[PDB]
Structure formats: structure tokens, C-alpha cells
């Protein structure tokens, strides 16, 4: 017997690597019933035509798992949606590689979806660890009115309520606005000084421009942000000493491809040893039923903890995301980013580089009236 997995990649050269991966997959341990085949397609500028072709390749090849990826054209919001919606009808597992938005984390909507990189609303643990190590108890939250901001706010609120402590204030600003001075002026007259920002770059530029006018980003303050606000065009108005977070393998794709190939091969090896299985549906237009071993395949994929790969252990959690991902804490000095800390997954540790806090000087600012 043979089983074949499908891929939706945006580079022909990657197809050279991906094939090699399965060529390496059915070389370490094969030679009976596990003759893996690889079928690949390419991304389409149009979104409607993606589903027709995706179940056309489903029909022609009756694949078991689909490996999706992100294109270079930056919208990164609806690119894997047509594949996840169509493949979710038959409950065939689909695991992404370079997706970060938190809408796909909801298991109620996207029934069968797995991720390799942690979502955007998953770095609040880094902020909590930084607060613990630097001993900042009074914070000011400032988020945007959207799914990502609400999810991050909920996660941070739960994490802080685990300690029976709450944030001083929670500001919510309209995404894509043009006048911010009122809210920031209101937040200016308070007690806490630590300001945590989580929003998109386009409005992050407006937030920075508004804040820089009110003489509030001077000395004695502390700024913490995510990853989106550091990259992009929002670096023009970023004040000095703004602490930020970065993933250690956020852009590499060959490592993710090898990781996905290895974990899928291990899952299929562990699953094919059990009887009472049914082949995928034959055609996209054939019949409307449900895969018998869909949820079983999803469970056996979730329980699969990879031993060691190019990106470390690949142990999932009971959500569809990745656990124990390293982080790099970067401070920018004089418009230049330099890594100053590293977060293993449990507790962060610093490096041998004295940071420069906002407004110059070098101390350990605390923050209080």
C-alpha cells in the first residue's frame, strides 16, 4: 500500500527541498507498505479558485494530510483560509508552517488545523516573565479593537489573575483611526509607568507619533511591545529603549518543511499499525460524508512528540499550537537592534550588554508617582 501527502507551497525551489524531505522520509525506515508519494500545487493570486483546485488534487490523489504555507505578498490573513475551509469538510488534517494570526487557533471554527509556530497572542508569557524578573507590578494595557487584541488581553488578564492581581487600566483604541491624543492624554495622568502595546504596524506608527508629541516617552518610562510593532515601516517613529520580542526561526521555511515531513511520517507510521481504517473520500464532487479516522488521526498527531529535529522538540499542546519555543528579547539603541536577552520557555535570561532605557541613562527604572 501507498499513502501520499499534499503540499501547497509558493516556491518551486521549495518543491526541490520538500521532495528531498519525503525522499529522506522514506529512506530511514521504509521498504514495506509505506511508499510515500508527494503531490504539490502552487498558490494562486485569486482566492476563489484555490478551493476548486484543492479538492481537485484531493480527488486525484486522496491525500492524507496537507501542508500549507504563506506567500511573500503580505496579507497573511486569508491566504490559508480557502484550504482550511474546504479540507475541513472531510476532516483531513491540515497543518500550517508560517501562520501567526490567532483566529485560526479557535478549534470551533477551523475544525482540523495545526500550527508549527506559536500564534501572535501567545507571547504574553514573555511579558509576564519580564515583569517578574524586573519587578514591575503596575502596568498599563493598551490594545486595539480586534480579535488579536481581545485574545491577547484575555490571556494576559487570566495570567495576571492567577496571581490575584489586575492591571491598572485597559485602553482599547479603534483600529485604523486618525486621532489618538485624547486616549493617550487620559492615560498620561495615572500612577503606573509601564506601557504594553499590541496592535498593527500601520496604527502603531500613529500611536508612536501621537505619544512622541506629549513628552511622555521621555526619561523614567518603560515601553514593551510585541513583534509586529518592531518590524515594518513603524520603525521611523519608534523611541529609544523600546523592548521587543522576536522569534528565532520566524522566517526559515526549509526547517519547517523538514519538521512537518518528519512528524507526519512518524504519525502515519504509528497510525497504520492499527486496523479499522478507511481511505479518504475519492472525489471532491463524489459524495458528502465524513472520514472515519479523521479525529483519530488528529489525536495521534497531537500525541506525537518528536524526539529532536533542526528546530528542537515539536511537542504540541491540547490546542493545535506549538509549545516550548525560544524567544529573543531585543532592545534598539540609536536606531540599531541588538539582542540582549533570550527566553527558553520557562524563564528568561539576560546577556552581557547593559541596556539603554528610554530617554537615555542606564538604571533600573521602577515607575510610580
Amino acid at each position: 500500500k501507498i499513502v501520499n501527502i499534499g503540499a501547497v507551497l509558493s516556491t518551486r525551489k521549495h518543491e526541490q527541498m520538500f521532495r528531498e524531505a519525503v525522499n529522506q522520509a522514506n529512506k530511514r525506515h521504509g521498504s514495506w507498505k509505506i511508499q510515500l508519494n508527494a503531490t504539490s500545487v502552487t498558490h494562486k493570486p485569486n482566492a476563489i479558485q484555490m478551493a476548486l483546485s484543492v479538492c481537485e488534487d484531493l480527488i486525484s490523489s486522496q491525500v492524507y494530510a496537507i501542508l500549507v504555507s504563506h506567500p511573500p505578498t503580505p496579507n497573511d490573513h486569508f491566504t490559508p483560509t480557502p484550504v482550511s475551509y474546504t479540507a475541513g469538510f472531510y476532516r483531513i488534517p491540515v497543518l500550517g508552517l508560517t501562520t501567526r494570526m490567532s483566529i485560526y487557533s479557535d478549534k470551533s471554527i477551523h475544525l482540523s488545523f495545526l500550527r508549527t509556530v506559536p500564534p501572535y497572542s501567545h507571547q504574553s508569557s514573555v511579558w509576564f516573565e519580564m515583569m517578574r524578573v524586573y519587578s514591575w507590578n503596575h502596568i498599563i494595557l493598551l490594545v486595539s479593537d480586534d480579535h488579536e487584541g481581545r485574545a491577547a488581553q484575555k490571556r494576559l488578564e487570566t495570567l495576571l489573575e492567577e496571581r490575584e492581581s489586575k492591571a491598572e487600566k485597559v485602553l482599547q483604541f479603534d483600529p485604523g483611526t486618525k486621532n489618538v491624543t485624547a486616549l493617550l492624554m487620559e492615560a498620561k495622568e495615572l500612577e503606573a509607568r509601564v506601557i504594553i502595546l499590541s496592535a498593527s504596524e500601520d496604527d502603531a506608527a500613529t500611536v508612536y507619533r501621537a505619544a512622541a508629541m506629549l513628552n511622555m516617552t521621555g526619561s523614567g518610562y518603560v515601553w514593551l511591545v510585541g513583534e509586529r510593532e518592531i518590524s515594518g515601516n513603524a520603525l521611523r517613529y519608534a523611541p529609544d529603549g523600546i523592548l521587543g520580542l522576536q522569534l528565532i526561526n520566524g522566517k526559515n521555511e526549509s526547517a519547517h518543511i523538514s519538521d512537518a515531513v518528519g512528524v507526519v511520517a512518524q504519525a502515519v507510521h504509528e497510525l497504520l499499525e492499527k486496523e479499522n481504517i478507511t481511505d479518504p473520500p475519492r472525489g471532491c464532487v463524489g459524495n458528502t460524508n465524513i472520514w472515519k479516522t479523521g479525529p483519530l488521526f488528529k489525536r495521534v498527531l497531537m500525541s506525537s512528540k518528536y524526539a529532536d529535529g533542526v528546530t528542537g522538540r515539536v511537542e504540541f499542546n491540547e490546542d493545535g499550537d506549538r509549545k516550548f519555543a525560544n524567544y529573543s528579547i531585543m532592545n534598539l539603541q540609536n536606531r540599531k537592534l541588538v539582542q540582549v536577552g533570550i527566553y527558553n520557555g520557562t524563564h528568561v535570561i539576560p546577556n552581557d550588554r547593559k541596556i539603554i532605557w528610554p530617554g537615555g541613562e542606564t538604571e533600573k527604572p521602577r515607575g510610580y508617582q
Partner: antibody, heavy 119, light 109 residues
Framework: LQLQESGPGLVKPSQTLSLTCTVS?????????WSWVRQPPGKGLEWIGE???????NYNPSLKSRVTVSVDKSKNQFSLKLTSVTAADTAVYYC?????????????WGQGTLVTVSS | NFMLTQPHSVSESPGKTVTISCTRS????????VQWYQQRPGSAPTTVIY?????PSGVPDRFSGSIDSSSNSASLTISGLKTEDEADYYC?????????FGGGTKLTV
């Protein structure tokens, strides 16, 4: 605020070179940055590195592992310690102060010294 | 890291206007500022343009600049040329990793 440059002329090939730029009319302990830039004869301008007043440096990636910049605010002078020099390093060397700003802007540049490497 | 390309020398007659540009090769000049530096031979180079439209209070009002973001270029519109303008001009911009200068320009009368 004005900057003064002083270099020990030419140096022997494949040796260590040390320039000393002094600042008169201001205090090193401030919220600015101090940097070095060099220009080969009839060529472009290449940035070397910047050093903050207190503790930390930044270097050009091409020549990162050949420079150990230093400062001393007890006497208000910063020094360059280029090591493992080559034959094609003869250039005019400048010491320039750049404000903290939010932009990288060099003002005011020093007089500059001429540095030649040969035997 | 990247590189800046600008033409070498421009010919012009007194009493008119000329423009030169150092077009960015890799990336786009929209997330960083550009600065234009004067340089008289045998002298320390001095600032003539910063933030693309500022002017220090030591230079006569004959310089201006703009960014089009179409060909990724910046302008150095100079009006009312005189005999005290024969010098070399530089353009400089930064990024998130390093700071790089440009080439050269030999304005002639």
C-alpha cells in the same frame, strides 16, 4: 563645542594603530553618541563604529572583528584601536558626534588626520 | 545592508536649477530618513539637508528635497547657482543593521 583630532602619523605595516580624538567645549557625559568615519583617497565614505558614552559599542559587520573602540570620560577622550591592519587601509580618519535624536545625523565633524600605512 | 547609487558629476550653467538623486538599490526609502551632506575640499563636511526638508540656520535658502517612492529616489533641487557652490555632495541613510553612505558628485559651473 568643538572637536580636536590627533593621530600618531604613519604606522609600520601589519601593526596596531591608535588614534586619540579630544573634545573641548562640552562634556562627554551627555545623551549623544560619538563615532568614527574614514575616507580612502578618492573613494567613498565608510562608517566604522559608534560608542555610547557609558558602556556599549556598535560596529560595522564587514570589519566587526577588528576594532576595539574605547572611551575615557575622566579625561574626555575616546580612542580607536584598529588591529591586524592590512596594506590597503590608508585613509583620512574623522571623529564625529551624532545626536541621540531619533535619526542618525553627524554634526559637527572634526578637522581630521591623515593616516598612511607603509614601511 | 544595501548600496546607494548616484551619478558622478553634473554639468550646468550659472543662473538656473539642477537636480541630482541617489536612488536606493535594495529596499525602499520610506522607513528611513535621508540626509544630504556638503563637503568643501580640504575641509570638514557639513550638513546641508536633514529630514528631507529641514535646513540649519547657517545655509541660504537655495536647497530643497522630496521623496517620490516611485523610482526610490530623493531630490536636491538647487536654485540660483553661484561661484561658491563648486564642491562635492554626499547622501546618507541608515537602516536596522548599519549605516552606509553614497558615491560622489562633482558639480561644475
Amino acid at each position: 563645542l568643538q572637536l580636536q583630532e590627533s593621530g600618531p602619523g604613519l604606522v609600520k605595516p601589519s601593526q596596531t594603530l591608535s588614534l586619540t580624538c579630544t573634545v573641548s567645549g562640552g562634556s562627554i557625559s551627555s545623551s549623544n553618541w560619538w563615532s568614527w568615519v574614514r575616507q580612502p583617497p578618492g573613494k567613498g565614505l565608510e562608517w566604522i563604529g559608534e560608542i555610547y558614552h557609558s558602556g556599549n559599542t556598535n560596529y560595522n559587520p564587514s570589519l566587526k572583528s577588528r576594532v576595539t573602540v574605547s572611551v575615557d570620560k575622566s579625561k574626555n577622550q575616546f580612542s580607536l584601536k584598529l588591529t591586524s591592519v592590512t596594506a590597503a587601509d590608508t585613509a583620512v580618519y574623522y571623529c564625529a558626534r551624532d545626536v541621540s535624536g531619533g535619526v542618525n545625523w553627524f554634526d559637527p565633524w572634526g578637522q581630521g588626520t591623515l593616516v598612511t600605512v607603509s614601511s | 545592508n544595501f548600496m546607494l547609487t548616484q551619478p558622478h558629476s553634473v554639468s550646468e550653467s550659472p543662473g538656473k536649477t539642477v537636480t541630482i538623486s541617489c536612488t536606493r538599490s535594495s529596499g525602499s526609502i520610506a522607513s528611513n530618513y535621508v540626509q544630504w551632506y556638503q563637503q568643501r575640499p580640504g575641509s570638514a563636511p557639513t550638513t546641508v539637508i536633514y529630514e528631507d526638508n529641514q535646513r540649519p540656520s547657517g545655509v541660504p535658502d537655495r536647497f530643497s528635497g522630496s521623496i517620490d517612492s516611485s523610482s526610490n529616489s530623493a531630490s536636491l533641487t538647487i536654485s540660483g547657482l553661484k561661484t561658491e557652490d563648486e564642491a562635492d555632495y554626499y547622501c546618507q541613510s541608515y537602516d536596522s543593521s548599519t549605516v552606509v553612505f553614497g558615491g560622489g558628485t562633482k558639480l561644475t559651473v
